[PDB]
Amino acid sequence: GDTRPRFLWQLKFECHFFNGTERVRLLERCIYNQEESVRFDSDVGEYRAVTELGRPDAEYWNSQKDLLEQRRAAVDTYCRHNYGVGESFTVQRRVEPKVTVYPSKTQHHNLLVCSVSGFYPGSIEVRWFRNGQEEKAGVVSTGLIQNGDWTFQTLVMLETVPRSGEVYTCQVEHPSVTSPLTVEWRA
Amino acid sequence: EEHVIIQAEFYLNPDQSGEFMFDFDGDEIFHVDMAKKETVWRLEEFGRFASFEAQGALANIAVDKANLEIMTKRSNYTPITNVPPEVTVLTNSPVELREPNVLICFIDKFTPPVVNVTWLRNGKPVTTGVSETVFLPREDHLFRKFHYLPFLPSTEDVYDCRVEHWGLDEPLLKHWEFDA
């Protein structure tokens, strides 16, 4: 078979945005196999070696002012520029979550399942309530799942000792909706 | 923080393969076909709102290769340590009999970025409707990847996502069947 050793090289330019395009930080990083050797943190202003292996480059590139000048301005020419290029279909993109509530095929006690799927952005909030009041304890989530197609999903269960008349509400709040989405379970 | 746009790229020997792509909060905006030399968008729509001079990515890839040779050489030809993929198989939305759905094979936390993935229906490989993504960056510098299989939920059917990767001692098969 194929047993030849592999040698990888990665390069990542990371544009980090805080409060829209207000404050911006550019993180340029070089990675040899699974190790970052050199980098440039716009907040630092120059290249810094992450390991001795990257020392030659940090020293070399830092000796070229034209370069350093271009990098320092990348927060604007690169980061901000690209942010605005796709702000309409990325920052502003919104897709309402599909919410449904049903008992799990597991579980005495009844394990309720709140399924929130196909939503975007990824930031979301789902809390359980019992007769109009939060359910701090008992909750258990699957975590935010990034489907890879610009769509997320997540399961958030609630352990309960159901009593006739009880109303267990799963509340979801998400950028795609102004007022929260709710789904009750009548006991 | 609020958002992150990453321009992740790589060159790998001796497979002589490379990648060049942009990423928004974990999702691929687009990547350049190293061969056809043209921008391919994760979603069709994007291509209608922005553009990218795909041709220019290859220039970076040449520089990437050279650098690789340099690093490989000064590291005393220290090869990459294989890291096996964590594999998970989920549905796009809660499964329901005969209600169309999609199988998502989540191959994550691995490296180098070379892998063979195959979908299986009752012991046999499926091709129709399958689609996959390129390698996605991770903060730990390993990779993520997704393969997709559109299907019609049943009770009889048993699927598998067959993942091959140097870091695995043997092909990993992820079992998935209707349990609802």
Partner: peptide, 13 residues
Amino acid sequence: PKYVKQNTLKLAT
């Protein structure tokens, strides 16, 4: 709107 890339720098030789 056109996306712009950062150019890859050559390593110290």
